Amino acid sequence: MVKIRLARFGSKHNPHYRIVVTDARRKRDGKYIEKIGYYDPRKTTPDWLKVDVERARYWLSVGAQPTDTARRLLRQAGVFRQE
Amino acid sequence: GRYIGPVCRLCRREGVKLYLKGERCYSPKCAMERRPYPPGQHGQKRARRPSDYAVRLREKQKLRRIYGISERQFRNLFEEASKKKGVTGSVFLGLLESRLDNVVYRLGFAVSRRQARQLVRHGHITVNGRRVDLPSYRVRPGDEIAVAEKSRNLELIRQNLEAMKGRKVGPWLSLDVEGMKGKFLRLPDREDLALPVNEQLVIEFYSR
Amino acid sequence: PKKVLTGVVVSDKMQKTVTVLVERQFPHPLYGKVIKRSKKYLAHDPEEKYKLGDVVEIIESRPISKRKRFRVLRLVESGRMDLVEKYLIRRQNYESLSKRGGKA
RNA sequence: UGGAGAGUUUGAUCCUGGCUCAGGGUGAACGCUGGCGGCGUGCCUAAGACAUGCAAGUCGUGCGGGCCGCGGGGUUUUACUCCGUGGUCAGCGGCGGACGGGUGAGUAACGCGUGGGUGACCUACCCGGAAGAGGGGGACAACCCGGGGAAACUCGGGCUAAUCCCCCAUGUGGACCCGCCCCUUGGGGUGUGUCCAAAGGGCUUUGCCCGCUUCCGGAUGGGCCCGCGUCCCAUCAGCUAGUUGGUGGGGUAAUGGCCCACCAAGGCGACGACGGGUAGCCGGUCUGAGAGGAUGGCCGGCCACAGGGGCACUGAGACACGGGCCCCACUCCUACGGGAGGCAGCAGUUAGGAAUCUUCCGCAAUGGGCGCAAGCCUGACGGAGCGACGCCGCUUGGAGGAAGAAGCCCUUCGGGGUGUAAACUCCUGAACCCGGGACGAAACCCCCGACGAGGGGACUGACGGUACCGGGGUAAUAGCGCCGGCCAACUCCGUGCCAGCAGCCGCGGUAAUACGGAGGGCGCGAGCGUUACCCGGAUUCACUGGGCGUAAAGGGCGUGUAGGCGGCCUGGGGCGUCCCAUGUGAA
Ligand SMILES: [Mg+2]
Ligand SMILES: [Mg+2]
Ligand SMILES: [Mg+2]
Ligand SMILES: [Mg+2]
Ligand SMILES: [Mg+2]
Ligand SMILES: [Mg+2]
Ligand SMILES: [Mg+2]
Ligand SMILES: [Mg+2]
Ligand SMILES: [Mg+2]
Ligand SMILES: [Mg+2]
Ligand SMILES: [Mg+2]
Ligand SMILES: [Mg+2]
Ligand SMILES: [Mg+2]
Ligand SMILES: [Mg+2]
Ligand SMILES: [Mg+2]
Ligand SMILES: [Mg+2]
Ligand SMILES: [Mg+2]
Ligand SMILES: [Mg+2]
Ligand SMILES: [Mg+2]
Ligand SMILES: [Mg+2]
Ligand SMILES: [Mg+2]
Ligand SMILES: [Mg+2]
Ligand SMILES: [Mg+2]
Ligand SMILES: [Mg+2]
Ligand SMILES: [Mg+2]
Ligand SMILES: [Mg+2]
Ligand SMILES: [Mg+2]
Ligand SMILES: [Mg+2]
Ligand SMILES: [Mg+2]
Ligand SMILES: [Mg+2]
Ligand SMILES: [Mg+2]
Ligand SMILES: [Mg+2]
Ligand SMILES: [Mg+2]
Ligand SMILES: [Mg+2]
Ligand SMILES: [Mg+2]
Ligand SMILES: [Mg+2]
Ligand SMILES: [Mg+2]
Ligand SMILES: [Mg+2]
Ligand SMILES: [Mg+2]
Ligand SMILES: [Mg+2]
Ligand SMILES: [Mg+2]
Ligand SMILES: [Mg+2]
Ligand SMILES: [Mg+2]
Ligand SMILES: [Mg+2]
Ligand SMILES: [Mg+2]
Ligand SMILES: [Mg+2]
Ligand SMILES: [Mg+2]
Ligand SMILES: [Mg+2]
Ligand SMILES: [Zn+2]
Secondary structure, three states: OEEEEEEEOOEOOEOOEEEEEEEOOOOOOOOOOEEEEEEOOOOOOOOOEEOOHHHHHHHHHOOOEEOHHHHHHHHHOOOOOOO | OOOOOOOHHHHHHHOOOOOOOOOHHHOOOOOOOOOOOOOOOOOOOOOOOOOHHHHHHHHHHHHHHHHOOOOHHHHHHHHHHHHOOOOHHHHHHHHHHHEHHHHHHHOOOOOOHHHHHHHHHOOOEEEOOEEOOOOOOEOOOOOEEEEOHHHOOOHHHHHHHHHOOOOOOOOOEOOEOOOOEOEEOOOOOOOOOOOOOOHHHHHHHOOO | OOOEEEEEEEEEEEOOEEEEEEEOOEEOOOOOOEEOOEEEEEEEOOOOOOOOOOEEEEEEOOOOOOOOOEEEEEEEEOOOHHHHHHHHHHHHHOOOOOOOOOOO
16 A cells, blocks of 8 residues: 655764655665655654645545554644644 | 964965965065065966966865965855855855854954964854854854853953954954954845955866 | 557558558757657557558557557548558668668 | 967969867876875775675564573472572574665666656555454474484474464455446446455553554555657668467466467568667766767665576565575585585785785764564765875965075186075974863653653764864975977087987987986976877868869769658648647756
């Protein structure tokens, strides 16, 4: 199935991830279906997480499955906040 | 320094006062006065009609030595000033003049750029407050260049900012001798530099 | 869009099939001038309907054989053996180009 | 924000013309030299051969067991026998092993690029919707019993569970023949007939969780087809017999000579067929003023390959690198019968070579497989290690300091040079020492809420006592090339067409700025030179952008085939050409 997961993009000791949609079977850094966010785990800037809940919600609706820290990040942007 | 070695022997090769060694270059002892010919055995001989290349070479040396920069470092700036929008001649001179090691010597924290290099490598200098020990650091406008807090009263920066009492600072820099701060207001207008060097030639050298 | 080409039938010699000759002008990548250039398609003709010389539109289509991947869509201009003849001489020439000559 | 030229044919000249230099680039290697760090990068040759270790498994919440323990029962006691529980092992079964990882050998091809087509198709796991699980039956491992082989391993007999296999039922629905309607290639309806379903498990047990069945849709991935693009040789000119097309079969998820039988005689080529050579293709890279040229190395995408050659099984997917069979070549075992292998996974060894790294740490992060979960596996990966191999930052000090030591070097014998350089005065304080010491990590999980949203909690660091912060603090590596012109930089001695230099032009035949050394000078600087290769200067294959009376170049002349090209006026079409919109042009 298609996943929502992290793609490692920074540099040696400088991790930045792209939050991506992709078939589970790509390499982690290979061709992805759509970037739908980014994550800087060092919080080196004020702007260290970013999602696009609209698209995130889209891919969930067609059954993308997010990895365990992708969903954590998605939640942190209120992808799932329903109230 | 970066060259490290006989300095006033370059004074004599370029035939112009360069002021690399600070204040003795103001004394009647700088070799340029009362020994103005190149170094070496043949330095007092009838000097041959210098080639077109020779002249563009020397003017570049004339510029690069005045800033104490290497050459790989120098070329990397000119090329950045090439690719940059604007007049590539005096966009070069602005970058050169934005080097922290030079800006410190402009604010008269040190009598020369070489002495100003050492004060930077030895953490005697703040930029905006945090230490910066990289002489190549690029000062941007708005940035405030202090003497390091715990340095402020060394025997050297004492007697050097004492000379700067009443002395005048370039148009593009402020300066505050009390707390030993200084600001970079604007990249220099080509007119502001009294540089004994036709930088038009330096462009012409790097295009053979 | 299934590609549609227009051409000249230059062969009836087959069962339920026509050779269609398709030209295309275009400017030459380096030297500018407009170069003609042509290619023969084998087209599916199930009524053995179209005849030597007919000018037909030919359409992309699901394979009928090796070679045959086009069907004859409609008839544009009926009859004109000049093109056939033009094409015919071109292959007549071929005979010359070899290792001998004379009356050959 | 874009274009520099020079040296060399002559006694001199102008032109033609080649050669050479200056510039940029590099997975480099060689020489002399070598201090720190960050980030990259590192078998170009043998797709040669490979020791050793590790590299794909997981699930007891599908099933039944063996072995080793412990505990509780039925009896008055033993014997026998029943139940519970701990460890362990494989077996049956499910999902994964078709991904990830390696390489570029082959391949000039729908292989790749690009844009389309599929009324000619598939898609496990995932999401949405509709509906469903009622009876019954069977076998094979494990285990038990025997045989055979040295071994790898193998044969026979008997027992048994299941989410293993089958039969009947239910028919939402679907499949197939025929018909009918709408569509229009095999798209979507509809009727009769026929055919087709299912599996159980766990509980904080009646109602939840995880599964199972059929169908319809989505999503992702893929098959196949087509237009157009893709190197050199014409001293390769003709090629083809499953060849080209038809009918009907077979085969497949599906179109197709894909394969087969029969029939017709086609198909292809100078717009380069057939043959030979070479090569993985692209995003991109390098160079260039551009147009071009060159290239495909890191990373990303496609393809292909897994000692060489075939092949099919299983399956959603493979004709499968760490699966199966056969043939070939090697190495190993061998009781001579027969067996065991396959680093182009990570390291590592050897061989070839001018040359290419550690048998390192860790699953903390990201990602993948299985598992409800706890977790397990992961040489993917995250790090560390070696090499100046590249890039970038940084140091070997700063300020003062003589009319100006000493040595060395010139000298017109007065002087001049190295040279503020050193010595020396003061100042700072790379190395080193002490102390604090990270970010990367908040989820899974547990509690509250409702296993939702939301809130609370706990656990976790290979790198690493590193980064960085603070306190101390020592004047602490400089090399290499060059100095006739092109090309920045000249003097002495030695040498005598020798020894030697030499990119090109040219130096050396006793006063050599060209050889060798010295002093000095120039250029770069932890690097500088050399070789090799690429583009450049090279308008020196000229499209931009050249030529052919004598420099190289008009065919000995014609005829006229293909082809190229084509006077003036009107009209239609709108292929070329131009315009707008739009889609594509991933990272
Ligand atoms: Mg001549
Ligand atoms: Mg001459
Ligand atoms: Mg001349
Ligand atoms: Mg490294
Ligand atoms: Mg190799
Ligand atoms: Mg392991
Ligand atoms: Mg047991
Ligand atoms: Mg087991
Ligand atoms: Mg070929
Ligand atoms: Mg194509
Ligand atoms: Mg469903
Ligand atoms: Mg039996
Ligand atoms: Mg079953
Ligand atoms: Mg039935
Ligand atoms: Mg090859
Ligand atoms: Mg050019
Ligand atoms: Mg091999
Ligand atoms: Mg093989
Ligand atoms: Mg399967
Ligand atoms: Mg099958
Ligand atoms: Mg396999
Ligand atoms: Mg294969
Ligand atoms: Mg292997
Ligand atoms: Mg290896
Ligand atoms: Mg060797
Ligand atoms: Mg390595
Ligand atoms: Mg994980
Ligand atoms: Mg790694
Ligand atoms: Mg934190
Ligand atoms: Mg964990
Ligand atoms: Mg000169
Ligand atoms: Mg002599
Ligand atoms: Mg000499
Ligand atoms: Mg020379
Ligand atoms: Mg450096
Ligand atoms: Mg050219
Ligand atoms: Mg040439
Ligand atoms: Mg021309
Ligand atoms: Mg010419
Ligand atoms: Mg002649
Ligand atoms: Mg001639
Ligand atoms: Mg003539
Ligand atoms: Mg002639
Ligand atoms: Mg004609
Ligand atoms: Mg005309
Ligand atoms: Mg014409
Ligand atoms: Mg048109
Ligand atoms: Mg467009
Ligand atoms: Zn001076």
